[PDB]
Amino acid sequence: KAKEIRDLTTSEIEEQIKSSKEELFNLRFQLATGQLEETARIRTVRKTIARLKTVAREREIEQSKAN
RNA sequence: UUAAGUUAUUAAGGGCGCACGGUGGAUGCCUUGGCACUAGAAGCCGAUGAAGGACGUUACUAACGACGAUAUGCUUUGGG
């Protein structure tokens, strides 16, 4: 997904982080009430959030060198 | 039959020999860990926050290892 992410503009990435965090919140609420049954999604969403943050930090590092 | 005489039999328990069990962890065989050295690098980090820690992180989580709210891991260049 790292190559797909690099196509997004910097404002799309923020919106995507904001949606993945909400999606992860809902899964943790479902797990606690005992009705989830698909526990493999929690790790997937966490890894996507980590990738988005990595690509976002890359651009901010890179532009400061050019500036 | 009566006298006189001699010598037998018991094992409550014990002793010795033998057979068969239990307890215990010596002996033999073994090695995951150690000990003494040789050759070649190197030796000491820190206010750009150290050495050493505390708390946390896995779907289910007590301890040790790994990691730090990007947490039982993220990106990239090579190998396979």
mmCIF file of C-alpha atoms (C1' of nucleotides) in Angstrom:
data_model
loop_
_atom_site.group_PDB
_atom_site.id
_atom_site.type_symbol
_atom_site.label_atom_id
_atom_site.label_comp_id
_atom_site.label_asym_id
_atom_site.label_seq_id
_atom_site.Cartn_x
_atom_site.Cartn_y
_atom_site.Cartn_z
ATOM 1 C CA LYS A 1 0.000 0.000 0.000
ATOM 2 C CA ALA A 2 3.033 2.244 0.281
ATOM 3 C CA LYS A 3 3.097 2.857 -3.467
ATOM 4 C CA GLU A 4 -0.629 3.614 -3.529
ATOM 5 C CA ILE A 5 -0.232 6.110 -0.696
ATOM 6 C CA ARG A 6 2.470 8.105 -2.450
ATOM 7 C CA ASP A 7 -0.043 9.148 -5.105
ATOM 8 C CA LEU A 8 -2.266 10.883 -2.554
ATOM 9 C CA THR A 9 -1.868 14.621 -2.068
ATOM 10 C CA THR A 10 -0.902 15.818 1.400
ATOM 11 C CA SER A 11 -4.476 16.814 2.259
ATOM 12 C CA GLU A 12 -5.899 13.449 1.224
ATOM 13 C CA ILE A 13 -3.476 11.704 3.568
ATOM 14 C CA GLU A 14 -4.741 13.654 6.575
ATOM 15 C CA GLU A 15 -8.321 12.759 5.749
ATOM 16 C CA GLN A 16 -7.332 9.116 5.380
ATOM 17 C CA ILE A 17 -5.608 9.050 8.767
ATOM 18 C CA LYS A 18 -8.659 10.648 10.334
ATOM 19 C CA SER A 19 -10.889 7.929 8.872
ATOM 20 C CA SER A 20 -8.658 4.984 9.731
ATOM 21 C CA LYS A 21 -8.477 6.076 13.360
ATOM 22 C CA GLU A 22 -12.276 6.105 13.557
ATOM 23 C CA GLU A 23 -12.528 2.725 11.843
ATOM 24 C CA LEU A 24 -10.094 1.321 14.391
ATOM 25 C CA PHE A 25 -12.029 2.845 17.283
ATOM 26 C CA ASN A 26 -15.196 1.096 16.160
ATOM 27 C CA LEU A 27 -13.467 -2.285 15.996
ATOM 28 C CA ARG A 28 -12.196 -1.950 19.541
ATOM 29 C CA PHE A 29 -15.671 -1.099 20.728
ATOM 30 C CA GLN A 30 -17.093 -4.154 18.973
ATOM 31 C CA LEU A 31 -14.441 -6.440 20.437
ATOM 32 C CA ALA A 32 -15.256 -5.314 23.973
ATOM 33 C CA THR A 33 -18.990 -5.962 23.677
ATOM 34 C CA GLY A 34 -18.089 -9.387 22.328
ATOM 35 C CA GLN A 35 -19.403 -9.289 18.749
ATOM 36 C CA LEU A 36 -16.572 -8.947 16.268
ATOM 37 C CA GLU A 37 -15.417 -12.385 15.055
ATOM 38 C CA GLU A 38 -12.913 -10.908 12.572
ATOM 39 C CA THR A 39 -9.984 -10.026 14.782
ATOM 40 C CA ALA A 40 -7.471 -9.789 11.946
ATOM 41 C CA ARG A 41 -8.700 -6.362 10.866
ATOM 42 C CA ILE A 42 -7.305 -4.616 13.941
ATOM 43 C CA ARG A 43 -3.684 -5.254 12.983
ATOM 44 C CA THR A 44 -4.345 -4.327 9.358
ATOM 45 C CA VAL A 45 -5.753 -0.901 10.178
ATOM 46 C CA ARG A 46 -2.921 -0.191 12.615
ATOM 47 C CA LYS A 47 -0.346 -0.960 9.961
ATOM 48 C CA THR A 48 -2.101 1.278 7.447
ATOM 49 C CA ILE A 49 -2.036 4.154 9.925
ATOM 50 C CA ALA A 50 1.683 3.602 10.456
ATOM 51 C CA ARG A 51 2.321 3.670 6.697
ATOM 52 C CA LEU A 52 0.344 6.874 6.250
ATOM 53 C CA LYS A 53 2.319 8.574 8.990
ATOM 54 C CA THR A 54 5.597 7.380 7.476
ATOM 55 C CA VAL A 55 4.803 8.791 4.039
ATOM 56 C CA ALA A 56 3.606 12.036 5.606
ATOM 57 C CA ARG A 57 6.860 12.460 7.516
ATOM 58 C CA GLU A 58 8.906 11.699 4.397
ATOM 59 C CA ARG A 59 7.532 14.673 2.460
ATOM 60 C CA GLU A 60 7.942 17.067 5.375
ATOM 61 C CA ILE A 61 11.552 15.967 5.822
ATOM 62 C CA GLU A 62 12.320 16.156 2.116
ATOM 63 C CA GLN A 63 10.897 19.605 1.415
ATOM 64 C CA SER A 64 12.831 21.171 4.286
ATOM 65 C CA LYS A 65 16.087 20.090 2.656
ATOM 66 C CA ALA A 66 15.021 21.740 -0.604
ATOM 67 C CA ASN A 67 14.031 24.871 1.323
ATOM 68 C "C1'" U B 1 -1.950 -102.051 86.503
ATOM 69 C "C1'" U B 2 1.368 -99.819 89.509
ATOM 70 C "C1'" A B 3 6.541 -98.230 90.206
ATOM 71 C "C1'" A B 4 11.496 -96.324 88.578
ATOM 72 C "C1'" G B 5 13.885 -94.044 84.380
ATOM 73 C "C1'" U B 6 15.031 -91.812 79.648
ATOM 74 C "C1'" U B 7 13.669 -88.879 75.774
ATOM 75 C "C1'" A B 8 9.959 -86.413 72.429
ATOM 76 C "C1'" U B 9 6.169 -82.353 70.989
ATOM 77 C "C1'" U B 10 4.662 -75.615 71.352
ATOM 78 C "C1'" A B 11 6.735 -70.305 68.593
ATOM 79 C "C1'" A B 12 3.627 -65.222 71.514
ATOM 80 C "C1'" G B 13 7.808 -63.375 69.401
ATOM 81 C "C1'" G B 14 13.242 -63.564 67.888
ATOM 82 C "C1'" G B 15 17.991 -65.326 64.850
ATOM 83 C "C1'" C B 16 20.477 -66.908 60.098
ATOM 84 C "C1'" G B 17 20.009 -68.123 54.748
ATOM 85 C "C1'" C B 18 17.047 -67.486 50.325
ATOM 86 C "C1'" A B 19 13.008 -65.215 47.022
ATOM 87 C "C1'" C B 20 10.036 -61.031 45.858
ATOM 88 C "C1'" G B 21 8.606 -55.779 46.603
ATOM 89 C "C1'" G B 22 8.962 -50.325 48.165
ATOM 90 C "C1'" U B 23 11.752 -45.972 49.419
ATOM 91 C "C1'" G B 24 16.061 -43.214 47.674
ATOM 92 C "C1'" G B 25 18.886 -41.004 43.909
ATOM 93 C "C1'" A B 26 24.728 -43.129 43.968
ATOM 94 C "C1'" U B 27 27.087 -45.353 39.361
ATOM 95 C "C1'" G B 28 27.534 -45.556 33.820
ATOM 96 C "C1'" C B 29 26.477 -43.147 29.277
ATOM 97 C "C1'" C B 30 25.053 -38.004 27.399
ATOM 98 C "C1'" U B 31 25.201 -32.216 26.709
ATOM 99 C "C1'" U B 32 22.097 -27.399 26.065
ATOM 100 C "C1'" G B 33 26.578 -24.505 29.902
ATOM 101 C "C1'" G B 34 31.275 -23.221 31.510
ATOM 102 C "C1'" C B 35 37.248 -22.780 31.866
ATOM 103 C "C1'" A B 36 42.163 -21.614 29.812
ATOM 104 C "C1'" C B 37 44.264 -19.687 25.466
ATOM 105 C "C1'" U B 38 45.913 -18.242 20.013
ATOM 106 C "C1'" A B 39 45.306 -14.971 15.584
ATOM 107 C "C1'" G B 40 42.996 -10.419 13.625
ATOM 108 C "C1'" A B 41 39.929 -5.949 14.553
ATOM 109 C "C1'" A B 42 38.803 -2.598 18.304
ATOM 110 C "C1'" G B 43 38.532 -0.033 23.206
ATOM 111 C "C1'" C B 44 35.068 6.030 25.900
ATOM 112 C "C1'" C B 45 29.313 7.009 25.594
ATOM 113 C "C1'" G B 46 26.761 11.952 27.001
ATOM 114 C "C1'" A B 47 22.706 18.651 27.023
ATOM 115 C "C1'" U B 48 21.348 16.496 19.113
ATOM 116 C "C1'" G B 49 19.798 14.128 26.643
ATOM 117 C "C1'" A B 50 23.985 8.880 28.336
ATOM 118 C "C1'" A B 51 24.694 4.146 31.421
ATOM 119 C "C1'" G B 52 20.666 1.989 33.927
ATOM 120 C "C1'" G B 53 15.564 1.700 34.651
ATOM 121 C "C1'" A B 54 9.755 2.467 35.181
ATOM 122 C "C1'" C B 55 5.495 1.891 32.540
ATOM 123 C "C1'" G B 56 3.284 0.127 28.235
ATOM 124 C "C1'" U B 57 2.608 -2.572 23.061
ATOM 125 C "C1'" U B 58 0.041 -9.242 20.322
ATOM 126 C "C1'" A B 59 -7.302 -11.343 18.987
ATOM 127 C "C1'" C B 60 -7.143 -14.207 23.577
ATOM 128 C "C1'" U B 61 -1.554 -12.218 28.250
ATOM 129 C "C1'" A B 62 1.469 -14.059 33.594
ATOM 130 C "C1'" A B 63 7.177 -14.077 32.755
ATOM 131 C "C1'" C B 64 11.594 -13.404 29.446
ATOM 132 C "C1'" G B 65 13.165 -11.695 24.628
ATOM 133 C "C1'" A B 66 11.858 -7.789 20.714
ATOM 134 C "C1'" C B 67 9.643 -2.958 20.052
ATOM 135 C "C1'" G B 68 7.821 2.654 21.804
ATOM 136 C "C1'" A B 69 1.149 5.903 21.263
ATOM 137 C "C1'" U B 70 3.819 4.809 13.715
ATOM 138 C "C1'" A B 71 4.743 0.069 19.935
ATOM 139 C "C1'" U B 72 5.082 -8.380 19.325
ATOM 140 C "C1'" G B 73 6.789 -2.905 14.627
ATOM 141 C "C1'" C B 74 6.951 1.480 9.597
ATOM 142 C "C1'" U B 75 9.889 2.865 4.731
ATOM 143 C "C1'" U B 76 13.793 1.905 1.244
ATOM 144 C "C1'" U B 77 18.140 -0.444 -1.225
ATOM 145 C "C1'" G B 78 20.331 -5.481 -1.863
ATOM 146 C "C1'" G B 79 19.985 -10.962 -0.845
ATOM 147 C "C1'" G B 80 16.596 -15.270 -0.886
#
